[PDB]
């Protein structure tokens, strides 16, 4: 199937307590592989997956250089945002950035991303055509005008369609045993009476990879959207993921309910019934 590489950065200002802390992480699909933390002692991009540890000293030198440069850029950007938004120098603010690319099963470029958020809301983003920007508000429109004039998009376009793609394909090959695997969910149901007339059914999916999955409850074959409690997919810690969906049902009527599980590791969706 297709694959993605994403880098996520978070800069947080802390007036009084020194310069903004900058943390960056890199992922291929749902597997993290690098990190950088401006507060850490090393001041280095660091490995966080076994298949990247093999990269030579020059890799680690260059990546560290690149990510430190980003760190300074977003430090400057935080100060500019203060100005644009007419905000006090006393407050703490957040600048987040995400970039990366998707490739098809044949390694071909599929899409590129380059986007920013300020205090948790869209600021500016490169559109899919990789030639234009979408600005969220009047402040970001200032940036948009500057970046259009300076042709900032053309560069990003390049990296996105070149370096980014090459890196992903390289990582996908080196980490083949990890990254090109699918682990199907192991499923089960639990059941707990909650009163004399109602019981909980909980449908579990465990040990699956990648994280994408769909769990749906039906009653007599009809989806039960609004009454299902569905938790966010969560990491097990071993590189696989977990999820459950529960419904409260009238006691004695458990058999009317079916849980449906869809995941790329399953040839056919599973149906579970208590």
């Amino acid at each position: 199937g297709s694959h993605s590489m994403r880098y996520f950065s978070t800069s947080v200002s802390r007036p009084g307590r020194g310069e903004p802390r900058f943390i960056a992480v890199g992922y291929v699909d749902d597997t993290q592989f690098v990190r950088f933390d401006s507060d850490a002692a090393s001041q280095r991009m660091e490995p966080r997956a076994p298949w990247i540890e093999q990269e030579g000293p020059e890799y680690w030198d260059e990546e560290t250089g690149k990510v430190k440069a980003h760190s300074q850029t977003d430090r400057e950007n935080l100060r500019i945002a203060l100005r644009y938004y007419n905000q006090s120098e006393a407050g703490s603010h957040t600048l987040q950035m995400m970039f990366g690319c998707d490739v098809g099963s044949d390694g071909r470029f599929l899409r590129g991303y380059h986007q920013y958020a300020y205090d948790g809301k869209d600021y500016i983003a490169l559109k899919e055509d990789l030639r234009s920007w979408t600005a969220a508000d009047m402040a970001a429109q200032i940036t948009k005008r500057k970046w259009e004039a300076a042709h900032v998009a053309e560069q990003q376009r390049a990296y996105l369609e070149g370096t980014c793609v090459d890196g992903l394909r390289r990582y996908l090959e080196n980490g083949k045993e990890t990254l090109q695997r699918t682990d199907p969910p192991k499923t089960h149901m639990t059941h707990h009476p909650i009163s004399d007339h109602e019981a909980t059914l909980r449908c579990w999916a465990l040990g699956f990879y990648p994280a994408e999955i769909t769990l749906t409850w039906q009653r007599d074959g009809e989806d039960q959207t609004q009454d299902t409690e569905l938790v966010e997919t969560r990491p097990a810690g071993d590189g696989t993921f977990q999820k459950w969906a529960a419904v409260v049902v009238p006691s004695g009527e458990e058999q009317r309910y079916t849980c449906h599980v869809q995941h790329e590791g399953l040839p056919k969706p599973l149906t579970l019934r208590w």
């Binding site: 880098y7 960056a24 890199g26 991009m45 990546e63 690149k66 990510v67 440069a69 980003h70 850029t73 400057e76 950007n77 500019i80 945002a81 644009y84 970039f99 200032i142 940036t143 500057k146 970046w147 300076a150 900032v152 990003q156 990296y159 370096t163 980014c164 090459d166 890196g167």
Partner: peptide, 7 residues
């Protein structure tokens, strides 16, 4: 590979 403009 990480990427190689101010607001």
């Amino acid at each position: 590979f990480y990427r190689y403009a101010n607001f």
